[PDB]
Amino acid sequence: ASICTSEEWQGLMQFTLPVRLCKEIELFHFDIGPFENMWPGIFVYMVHRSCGTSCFELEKLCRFIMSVKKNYRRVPYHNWKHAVTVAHCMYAILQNNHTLFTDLERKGLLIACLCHDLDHRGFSNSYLQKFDHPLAALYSTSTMEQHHFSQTVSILQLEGHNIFSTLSSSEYEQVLEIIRKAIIATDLALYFGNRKQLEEMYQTGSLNLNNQSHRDRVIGLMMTACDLCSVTKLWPVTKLTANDIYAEFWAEGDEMKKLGIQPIPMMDRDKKDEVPQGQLGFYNAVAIPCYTTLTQILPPTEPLLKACRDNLSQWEKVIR
Numbered sequence: 001a002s003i004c005t006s007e008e009w010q011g012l013m014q015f016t017l018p019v020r021l022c023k024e025i026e027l028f029h030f031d032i033g034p035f036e037n038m039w040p041g042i043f044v045y046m047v048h049r050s051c052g053t054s055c056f057e058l059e060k061l062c063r064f065i066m067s068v069k070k071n072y073r074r075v076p077y078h079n080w081k082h083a084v085t086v087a088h089c090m091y092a093i094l095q096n097n098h099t100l101f102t103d104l105e106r107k108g109l110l111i112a113c114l115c116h117d118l119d120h121r122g123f124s125n126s127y128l129q130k131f132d133h134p135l136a137a138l139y140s141t142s143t144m145e146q147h148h149f150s151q152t153v154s155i156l157q158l159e160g161h162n163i164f165s166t167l168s169s170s171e172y173e174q175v176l177e178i179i180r181k182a183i184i185a186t187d188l189a190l191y192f193g194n195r196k197q198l199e200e201m202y203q204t205g206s207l208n209l210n211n212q213s214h215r216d217r218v219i220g221l222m223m224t225a226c227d228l229c230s231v232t233k234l235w236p237v238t239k240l241t242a243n244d245i246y247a248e249f250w251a252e253g254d255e256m257k258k259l260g261i262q263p264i265p266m267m268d269r270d271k272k273d274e275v276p277q278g279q280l281g282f283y284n285a286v287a288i289p290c291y292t293t294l295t296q297i298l299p300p301t302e303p304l305l306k307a308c309r310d311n312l313s314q315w316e317k318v319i320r
């Protein structure tokens with residue numbers, strides 16, 4: 001794994017954060033998009049507010065963040081901006097439900113959100129598994145997700161990067177399991193089963209947050225809520241993000257075509273006309289149920305569902 005220069009992390013320590021952004025960052029609709037130079041700084045701020053000013057030794061934290069940034073590729077969608085967008089959505093969830101989660105979970109989840117797509121190559125799990133890529137031989141299921149977690153550990157086991165070193169033997173193992181389960185939950189393939197089980201546990205009153213399996217499941221749905229949060233931003237932001245998702249999906253579809261294989265419509269740039277109906281189906285089948293279940297379990301997350309419904313109405317306006 002790549003190591004950040006000393007200039008990078010030292011520049012991060014002195015980073016302030018405009019006072020006008022302090023109130024803005026707490027809101028679910030917050031789009032980091034216009035503050036590029038501030039993103040690593042935005043992450044420090046979020047960790048300090050949620051976990052406390054002395055949770056991690058500033059040196060190691062700033063080293064970790066800048067090295068996490070350096071290991072993200074210059075892909076159109078699954079890049080550094082995506083990692084920070086996802087961590088910000090988690091920050092907002094955690095702030096709005098602060099005491100339902102422990103100090104370890106809050107630090108584990110923020111770190112996992114930032115690391116969740118580490119070293120993403122611009123390719124899906126279906127692609128890598130179809131074209132027998134080495135990563136697909138090393139990890140049978142949740143291919144990239146298993147690699148993203150492996151990349152997290154590689155950054156942790158770097159000189160002066162171990163942000164969890166002050167925890168106990170027990171706690172370090174706990175935080176690493178929280179991170180692993182959270183990163184694996186970002187594999188959309190696992191989501192459908194997860195969401196169905198939670199809807200069942202909620203509608204029958206059996207859901208219990210103290211039950212570790214039920215807990216891991218709620219945490220899993222939170223990771224999904226964060227990973228898909230572009231659908232919860234203001235319409236022009238959601239639109240702009242859709243261009244980046246497509247830029248990546250269509251570059252994948254192009255590689256498949258060169259190998260004489262027809263990609264699914266979302267990865268086919270010749271099928272752009274079906275983008276509005278494709279977005280519509282995704283909202284109806286994935287996004288809406290995700291936020292609906294999340295709102296039932298964690299009511300202060302309701303603005304995510306409202307913003308997703310608002311965007312569903314927008315795609316509906318595009319179709320007509």
Ligand SMILES: CCOc1ccccc1-c1ccc(-c2nc3ccncc3c(O)c2C#N)cc1
Binds near residue numbers: 230278
């Ligand atoms: C998958 C997660 O990516 C996202 C993550 C976050 C937000 C949106 C998305 C998202 C990407 C592509 C599409 C999409 N585009 C299509 C284009 C043409 N024809 C069929 C299509 C289609 O069926 C689908 C589907 N679903 C839908 C949703």
Ligand SMILES: [Mg+2]
Binds near residue numbers: 116117
């Ligand atoms: Mg991912």
Ligand SMILES: [Zn+2]
Binds near residue numbers: 078082086116117186
């Ligand atoms: Zn992601």
